[PDB]
Symmetry: D2
Subunit: 270 residues, 4 copies
């Protein structure tokens, strides 16, 4: 596979270590991943965006190379960390590129917390409620029953769940990039924890304020998304992007794997 992004740095967020890294120089561009993934979703994207921007990426608290504490790692926490990183990085009016729960996080940070962006690219965002597959919804009710699974059975569930996000099946090498953080004893608990902490109110609170903002918004949408119906993406575009949707054929929820070129084009050909 293509190389993993180097998240060399550690930011202390309220006693938790947050992994982050940067590439390139120029105007700031911040990349925000979703669940159950990590900044590695940008490994074929960030290097091309870094030719003309200083690109920032970090792993959400509870994900990837960041700490996975027995603590609040929900969307109620992630926009606080997002704002804290922008201040740590001393950046103003960043370009923002965000996927899934990362999209929820930057929509909360703008509409609830007032953070100004220079422009915003969303990729299959979780943005209007209710949201959540039946698996997420069922697992959230039996957390201890799933965290206690034998390692191989957990391995199989994580592998299948990640597989639902793509229209083209991943190679095992690539699937491993996203699965591996969840396979340690801490990671297995962390996987079901962030599912169990999901709550509709985090998205509903942001959605109540949606309106076209004072910066351009574009929404890249994998048409074959098994998790969110296409018409929900169009409804979001109607609400904040003047009805504009960048539809990506033969791509599922994880457009970064099915069609990273689509995201590169959307950001660079703006």
């Amino acid at each position: 596979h293509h190389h993993m992004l180097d998240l060399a740095n550690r930011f202390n967020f309220e006693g938790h270590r947050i992994a982050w890294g940067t590439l390139g120089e120029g105007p700031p561009l911040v990349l925000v991943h979703g669940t159950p993934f990590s900044s590695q979703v940008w490994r074929r994207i960030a290097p091309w965006l870094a030719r003309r921007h200083r690109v920032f990426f970090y792993d959400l608290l509870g994900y990837g190379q960041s700490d996975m504490p027995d603590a609040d790692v929900s969307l109620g926490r992630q926009n606080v960390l997002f704002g804290a990183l922008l201040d740590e990085w001393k950046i103003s009016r960043p370009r923002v590129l965000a996927h899934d729960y990362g999209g929820a996080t930057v929509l909360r940070a703008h509409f609830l917390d007032g953070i100004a962006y220079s422009d915003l690219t969303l990729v299959n965002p979780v943005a209007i409620a209710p949201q959540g597959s039946p698996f997420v919804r069922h697992v959230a009710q039996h957390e201890a029953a799933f965290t206690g699974l034998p390692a191989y059975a957990h391995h199989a569930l994580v592998s299948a769940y990640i597989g639902q996000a793509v229209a083209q099946p991943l190679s095992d090498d690539v699937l491993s990039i996203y699965r591996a953080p969840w396979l340690t004893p801490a990671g297995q608990a962390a996987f079901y924890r962030q599912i169990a902490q999901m709550r509709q109110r985090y998205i509903e609170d942001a959605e109540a304020r949606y309106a076209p903002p004072d910066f351009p918004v574009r929404i890249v949408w994998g048409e074959d998304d098994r998790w969110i119906p296409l018409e929900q993406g169009q409804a979001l575009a109607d609400r904040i992007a003047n009805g504009k949707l960048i539809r990506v054929p033969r791509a599922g929820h994880l457009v970064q794997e099915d069609a990273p070129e689509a995201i590169v084009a959307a950001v660079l050909d703006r």
Copy 2:
């Protein structure tokens, strides 16, 4: 793959349909499968045994093509069904070939119910208490939590669980033979039902009476079985087979897939 066995007959067992079939002519030989499989474990074995025997095979109540009722399908039921079928078939002193819970069933039918056999070939039988893999032991405590899973997640767990039974991974075609009965709504509930009903007492009651029986016994034992430790196979051989164990290297629990030739040899090369 090889042809599936035709189980074209239906026997009424206390109001439940039991699928069964036969091949060949000659002395009777009855094949008994275990969990979570079906008579299809004999599809590469029964045709060769049928050259000189009238071979009978049936699907346990709750498995395969037999009915999957919300009722007792435990080992406490299966020996009753086994004896009822021997009566229905009007067979006396069959040769017996049995695997896993099929082995427990024919051991109970002989040592508890007094049924005489011509000879007995066991393949990785569940015969010594306690028995239960980590997945079965864990899932037994969370039945509704697992039956409630979305189809693709249950699909993932069943595929992985079946995979633990073999040393050489199955092709998808062959895995599908064993997985498919558990994927309908009734099959999904039935899969977790037969796990929830497992009890050590069904094995313990037979084990308390173990001794060399009044017919030849041999035990074919896949050495790499992930579900039953070799020590219990050695114990069974010491208790009922005068220390004789046919160890099969590089074969897991499901010897019928890793090394069906070993079972054909054990039965035919007396």
Copy 3:
């Protein structure tokens, strides 16, 4: 996989039908593939370039969906066809995006035939002599022996040869896209024919004239190319691009499959 590009049009070139298609509106951009592939190498690239350009793509004579005649299909012919299509399409100073033998063809058309471009993006071009893989050099000496192979053996060789062009193995569905044109009786003969017609002089004639052209030029280079050494890519960049290569890590010859996002970035982030 992603949709195949629709090449619904046919151009009559000296009695041979040439397949081609177009997407988008605006300034013209022409895409030129290489061997042994087709315009399908642009199926994840052309749609994004078509957002702001009218994209044209065609299959080289002897390739893809174009006719596969028992005639000259070498690079000596392809620049004549390229110029004929530009005239047919009535396009002036197109942007050009070209790979492998497509690069050789557009370099010949500019440096030998004087055709003007407004911009040139080359991807792992065949441009510096000598060029040719071990398979090509061997098979060029035994055309009849390989054409005479039974279908499944030719199938295996074409599959293996195509696989040498990528760093990440293709799915069988994607490999089929590129292999299928070569599997008919006519396609099997055409595959070895275009190998046997290769000659270094077609490259050498163009190379003698290389200098920085009067339009911008950039070279995308998959670093792990098994068919062209990096040093020849650098030599070309030294001659026509002021020493600049856009290096693509973990990408082989067929950057379109290993890293299509790199090509999209190189064209659009100009």
Copy 4:
């Protein structure tokens, strides 16, 4: 996969080392493989035949672990070696189990050289003229073009050719067992060498003498054999086996991989 047979011994055949091994004790049983394979075709069969026989197996000159000389390795040589081994092993009237060119060899040794057997089991033997797949016939006419292939192309050809012998595709681990001897520089030359040395006369000379022998003959025939038409198997059965075939459904030429249990049953169930 199941472990490889240990051919621990070496026999001097006319200045060439021949690999051979034995398992078990009791009456002799000699196993003879065919092309392009080795004694490893018996790795799941020989251990079960050894429970009551002393089983002998060796690799044909030119194959497997035996020497691969630039010398005659054809069927014209192999019956000489077979007779020399029987004499070296001091065995008389052995049971014989032979496949493919191994069948041709033991048929030639009996009907042309007069060696008496006590029992003969043939598996998809080469025995009736003419015999030879289009791949074999074409490669035999262009030997130098194929031996000079790049290693990866030879690897793909050998893999595909072996794949034609099975109805169920091999795992790569198992395919490796059969492919590996042909991948060294010496093995690559040796692979095309034994194809190029094939001649119909070796079969025709034996076929002219076929008649029911003074020992039992059984013919195991994989019904899906792509290399030898079923009609030639029935023709052989009519001439030396009283018209009897042991048909094996859903098995190809290499019955040892598709259905080793069928060969075990055929030898032992008597």
